[PDB]
Every structure is written in C-alpha cells, then in structure tokens.
Swiss-Prot record, chain A:
Source organism per UniProt: Homo sapiens
Compartment annotation: Nucleus
Consequence recorded when altering residue 99 to A: Strongly reduced monoubiquitination of FANCD2
Name by which UniProt lists this protein: Fanconi anemia group F protein
Disease: Fanconi anemia complementation group F: A disorder affecting all bone marrow elements and resulting in anemia, leukopenia and thrombopenia. It is associated with cardiac, renal and limb malformations, dermal pigmentary changes, and a predisposition to the development of malignancies. At the cellular level it is associated with hypersensitivity to DNA-damaging agents, chromosomal instability (increased chromosome breakage) and defective DNA repair.
Assembly behavior: Belongs to the multisubunit FA complex composed of FANCA, FANCB, FANCC, FANCE, FANCF, FANCG, FANCL/PHF9 and FANCM. The complex is not found in FA patients. In complex with FANCA, FANCG and FANCL, but not with FANCC, nor FANCE, interacts with HES1; this interaction may be essential for the stability and nuclear localization of FA core complex proteins.
Protein's job: DNA repair protein that may operate in a postreplication repair or a cell cycle checkpoint function. May be implicated in interstrand DNA cross-link repair and in the maintenance of normal chromosome stability.
Residues of the full protein shown: 176 to 355 of 374
Disulfide bonds: none
Top-rank taxon, per record: Eukaryota
Effect listed in the UniProt record for changing residue 154 to A: Strongly reduced monoubiquitination of FANCD2
From Swiss-Prot, chain B:
Organism of provenance: Homo sapiens
Residue span relative to the full protein: 303 to 462 of 622
Subcellular location as annotated: Nucleus; Cytoplasm
Disease: Fanconi anemia complementation group G: A disorder affecting all bone marrow elements and resulting in anemia, leukopenia and thrombopenia. It is associated with cardiac, renal and limb malformations, dermal pigmentary changes, and a predisposition to the development of malignancies. At the cellular level it is associated with hypersensitivity to DNA-damaging agents, chromosomal instability (increased chromosome breakage) and defective DNA repair.
Outcome of mutating residue 81 to A: No effect on BRCA2-, FANCA-, FANCF-, nor XRCC3-binding
Superkingdom assignment: Eukaryota
Name of protein: Fanconi anemia group G protein
C-alpha cells in the first residue's frame, strides 16, 4: 500500500515500527516475510534494503533467532550472506581459549557462547553449494590470517574447522 | 666411574660351608650394591648431566641407549632398575642432554624413536573433537615438550 502511495519511504514506517512495538516478536515476523512466495517480492526487496541500511537492528536479528531461519534467509536473498559472515567473523575474534576447561568463552556475558556459534556455522554449511563454498573459504582465509596452526588453543577458526568434520 | 664401566665389562663352589653362604646378598642401602654396566653408565650420564658437561653427557647417554636397544644377539644388558628410572624417562634424559649439546636433529630422532614404538599406548585424542577424564602418562606430554624445544 505505502509502495504504491509513494507518500513517505517504507524506511520511515519500518523505523517507527522498531521504535514502538515488541521487537523480539517483530523480527521473527520479518524473517518469515522474506520466504513467503509472491502474492500479487517487492516487500522482500524493501526489507533487505531497510536491514542493510540499519546494521544495528540487523545485529539483533542475527542474534535473536534460530540458525535454520537465517540459513534460509541467506540461500534466498544472497545480499545478506557476506554481512552476517562478517558478524561471526567479528564475534569469534572476541573469544579466548582457557586451558583448564576445554572451551572458548566470552569475556562479557552478552558474547555468543561456543555452542551458539558452532550451531550457526554448522547451519551455513548444511546448506546449498552457493553459500557453502563462500562461508568455507571465508573461514579458511580467516584461519591463515590468525596463523595457519593445525591444533587448537590458538586460532578460534582452527577450532571451528576441526569441529565441522 | 668411567673406569668402573669398562671394569664391569669383565666377569668356585666347594663341598664345604664357606662364609659367602652365610653372608646376606646385599641391599640398596649397602656400599656393596653395584649394578650392571647399564645401571651405572646411566649413573655416569646423570652425574655428567647435573655438572654441565652436556657434550660428554650426550655421548654417554647414546652409548647407554645403543646397548639396550641393539641387544637381541648378546647378553642382556638391562634397563635402569625401578627404584631407578623407567625406560622412557631415560629416552627424555637422552634428549635433554642432546639439547644442552645443541644436537637438535638428534633430539628429534629421539622424540620420533619414542612415539614410533609407543603409538598403541597413546590416547587417540578425540576429546579434542568432542568439545580430566581420559588417561595420558606424563612421559607422552613431555615427549612433545622436548620435540618442541628442538
């Protein structure tokens, strides 16, 4: 309706949503929105551009859902893939190994635990080949960047790549 | 000690009661306890190593180790006895000499020799994947520690 009216941009409408309503619920909506087949995907093409415009909400999107939902978001709208890989690339690099407990952990409370990130990567991998090679290469290039070790203790990305076989 | 070792290289019963009969075969606390070449040559190498004659030490440890391991054909020359050190603590002392020397490409034929023989004994280390409980004898965890210093 607002698309054909052309009065205010949909961005303003989506921003007022974000401000006003329960956010948690809201986002699952959008997520489902993106996979609904066309009915008259101008809507879907508006939501990708709103999200990419605002990185801060899209940080809580990738944070707030399950893995499968975001895996399908990616295989359908590949304009999201390399920003979300960017997010993990940014959260993994905020980990450290501790030798007492056989685990990476976060400094801060709000930092993805190991298991969460393992899930999400396992998902990107359990996917179509169009994404799988992208994320595999995006990790191997991240591994070489932090020393190509081939034992854990050292490179978070070693860890992931061992864990995924 | 150097003389002694060559000494122990070298080697009658009367139908009578002799004194030898009545004496006790001695203890470890006694000053009459004298091991075999192997048990000593280990002493020479230990005593050579704690002074800082790493070079001498190296050779001595190698000679220890030559005896023990080549020995299918001759007399049994034996390990250092088990109030004395286990057969792998002794490949480790051999390597720590070979490091004090700076013979590091010998100190790696050592740590290769060891874990070649003892494959089976090691953990298959799949707790690494599954991320206290599984069992690893200190000398395997060392062997990597001195494989490294090399």
């Amino acid at each position: 309706e607002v698309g054909k009216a052309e009065a205010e941009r949909p961005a303003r409408f989506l921003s007022s949503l974000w401000e006003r309503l329960p956010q948690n619920n809201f986002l699952k909506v959008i997520a489902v929105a993106l996979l609904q087949p066309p009915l008259s995907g101008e809507g879907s093409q508006v939501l990708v551009h709103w999200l990419l415009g605002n990185s801060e909400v899209f940080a809580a999107f990738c944070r707030a859902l399950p893995a499968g939902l975001l895996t399908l978001v990616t295989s359908r709208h590949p304009a999201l893939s390399p920003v979300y890989l960017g997010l993990l690339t940014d959260w993994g690099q905020r980990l450290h190994y501790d030798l007492q407990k056989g685990i990476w952990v976060g400094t801060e409370s709000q930092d993805v635990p190991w298991e969460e990130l393992h899930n999400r990567f396992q998902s990107l991998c359990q996917a179509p080949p169009p994404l799988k090679d992208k994320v595999l290469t995006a990790l191997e290039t991240c591994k070489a960047q932090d020393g190509d070790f081939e034992v854990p203790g050292l490179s978070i990305w070693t860890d992931l790549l061992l864990a995924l076989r | 000690l150097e003389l002694l070792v060559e000494a122990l290289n070298v080697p009658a019963p009367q139908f009578l009661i002799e004194v030898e009969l009545l004496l006790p075969p001695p203890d470890l606390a006694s000053p009459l306890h004298c091991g075999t070449q192997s048990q000593t040559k280990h002493i020479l190498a230990s005593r050579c190593l704690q002074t800082g004659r790493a070079g001498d030490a190296a050779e001595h440890y190698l000679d220890l180790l030559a005896l023990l391991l080549d020995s299918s054909e001759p007399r049994f020359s034996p390990p250092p006895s088990p109030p004395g050190p286990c057969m792998p603590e002794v490949f480790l002392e051999a390597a720590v000499a070979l490091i004090q020397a700076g013979r590091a490409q010998d100190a790696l034929t050592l740590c290769e020799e060891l874990l070649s023989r003892t494959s089976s004994l090691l953990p298959k280390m799949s707790r690494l994947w599954e991320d206290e409980l599984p069992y690893c004898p200190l000398w395997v965890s060392a062997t990597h520690l001195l494989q490294g210093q090399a």
